[PDB]
Design a protein around this ligand. Sequence first.
Ligand SMILES: CO[C@@H]1O[C@H](CO)[C@@H](O)[C@H](O)[C@H]1S[C@@H]1O[C@H](CO)[C@@H](O)[C@H](O)[C@H]1O
Ligand SMILES: *[C@@H]1O[C@H](CO)[C@@H](O)[C@H](O)[C@H]1NC(C)=O
Ligand SMILES: *[C@@H]1O[C@H](CO)[C@@H](O)[C@H](O)[C@H]1NC(C)=O
Ligand SMILES: *[C@@H]1O[C@H](CO)[C@@H](O)[C@H](O)[C@H]1NC(C)=O
Length: 604
Amino acid sequence: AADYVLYKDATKPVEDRVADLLGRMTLAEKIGQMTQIERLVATPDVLRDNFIGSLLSGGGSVPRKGATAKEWQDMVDGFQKACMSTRLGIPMIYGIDAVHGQNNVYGATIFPHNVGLGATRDPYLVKRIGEATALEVRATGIQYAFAPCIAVCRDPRWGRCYESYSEDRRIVQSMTELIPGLQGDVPKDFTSGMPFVAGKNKVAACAKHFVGDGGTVDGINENNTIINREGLMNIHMPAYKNAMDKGVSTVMISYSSWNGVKMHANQDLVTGYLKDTLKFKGFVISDWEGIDRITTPAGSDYSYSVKASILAGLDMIMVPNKYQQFISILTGHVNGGVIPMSRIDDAVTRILRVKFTMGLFENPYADPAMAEQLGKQEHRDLAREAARKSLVLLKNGKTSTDAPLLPLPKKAPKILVAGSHADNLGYQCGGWTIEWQGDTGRTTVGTTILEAVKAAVDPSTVVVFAENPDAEFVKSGGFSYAIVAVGEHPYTETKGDNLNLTIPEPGLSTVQAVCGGVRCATVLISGRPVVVQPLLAASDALVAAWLPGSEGQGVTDALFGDFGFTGRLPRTWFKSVDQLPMNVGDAHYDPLFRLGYGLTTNAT
Ligand SMILES: CO[C@@H]1O[C@H](CO)[C@@H](O)[C@H](O)[C@H]1S[C@@H]1O[C@H](CO)[C@@H](O)[C@H](O)[C@H]1O
Ligand SMILES: *[C@@H]1O[C@H](CO)[C@@H](O)[C@H](O)[C@H]1NC(C)=O
Ligand SMILES: *[C@@H]1O[C@H](CO)[C@@H](O)[C@H](O)[C@H]1NC(C)=O
Ligand SMILES: *[C@@H]1O[C@H](CO)[C@@H](O)[C@H](O)[C@H]1NC(C)=O
């Protein structure tokens, strides 16, 4: 046609489309592509006027409580209509933390957190979870998931240990299969470091947080990782190469420092290593107010934050609120020659490369036929499989000569289900579920451990629930056995940092009351190893269930012997927090349970 514009031609090669569009852009259009804002500060005028490149939902940033998939699609499409109305019509990309399913959304399947996935040693399971997650994210109109976290947690006092598959880099490397699940498999020909997304039923992925987020002193979140280059490259870096080989579209930078250098200011690692050595050609995104946190106190020199980060090689800044100040400062740095146009053009080349590659110019709007993928039963069946595979049986009898307690019989006259975590969907999902920090009670659609027991047992079995029964209640109750579930409360990021790793009361006291009256199976809900000798001493059987998500029937599938226990510890279980850090090759390696430990059962 006479009004032909090459970048708008879907038959043209991505690199030609990128260069064609880049060549038309003004500095304001270029800096707008580099800007990611919260939906909370977005309006149609803001998105058009500042040529915004991306939006996100932070944890709990939702159009309303209980919103349907269509409500999400209508919100995202509203923002997109504004972006498509700009002079160049560059669609925005919408990101979200879909880190164990599409976890901010009511009715989304919630998969086990990464630590329990590590326990499965099943990369294909994790790929299938990426596939199901992409469908439930696209059900809501969202095109970009901030996952996987390929942190290698080296100290369980870290609040984000549950977001790491393992302390063993080799397990983390294996679980990079989430990437082709979320994005699609890369073709035969594929060049390591290029971005890839198969099309409108897949999402852009994000390898995070580059690099050494799991290596910080005493597990302090966002703090310093003190390790020589050989150890950074041997432990923290390897899974990023697997991510490049699988075509991960984006990389998010860590709040943490390496030997005192902020990652958000580290040109040698972000440009010298990730871009120039690993040949990454997708886009690099900040963390949330990550450039503000380059300084002490955070946000005390935002002009320096902007200069340091953009010169380090970051492409897109998760501002996410003060966009006027970000755009203004960056524009002033370019106008002043402090940041060269070559750097702006690289950042925009990478952002557009991802957008064109993933088909976002061809399919900028949501597909209403995808809405019904949210919470689909096949995905729940997958989450139930994953939860069951994640369980690690730590004890199954007090002595070598006792009858094994597990598997339990489905037919018994009366059984007890007890503990703070037995009937609390929010607790079994943990952080990053509906709210940022997670929450308590019936926050979404799912099955608690109590509901799963009631669904599993013979009709003649009477199930009694008591959250915190006393010893006499148990001894007088006529119970065959008890299932008692206790553990950690939900947490995220620095709220989770914990130097004592002792579960909250009344958990141990409830286990001791229950188990002292009747044979008991203790189900421990945690993001990590926690002080466990007292729980073990009380219990006939004890299962580390991690944070198994919405499908509590995965727990009962192994308790009642439909399947055998197969999970193995993906991290060391410490005897004492004074040991830490303590990893599977140090001089003082003296675990309660070594990495890889796990008892088994046979299906009944
Ligand atoms: C209400 O959330 C908080 O908003 C203020 C400013 O209005 C920010 O400065 C805070 O950092 C966030 S806290 C928390 O941050 C998460 C990322 O670390 C994000 O995913 C979540 O939405 C926020 O609640
Ligand atoms: C580590 O945390 C300490 C104590 O909160 C803080 O003062 C220091 O700046 C932090 N270091 C880094 C690199 O973040
Ligand atoms: C353990 O640490 C957490 C916070 O890090 C705290 O809330 C809890 O009370 C501590 N428990 C004990 C017994 O010190
Ligand atoms: C479970 O299966 C294997 C046989 O393949 C056996 O060696 C193991 O001891 C069995 N344990 C049981 C049935 O309790």
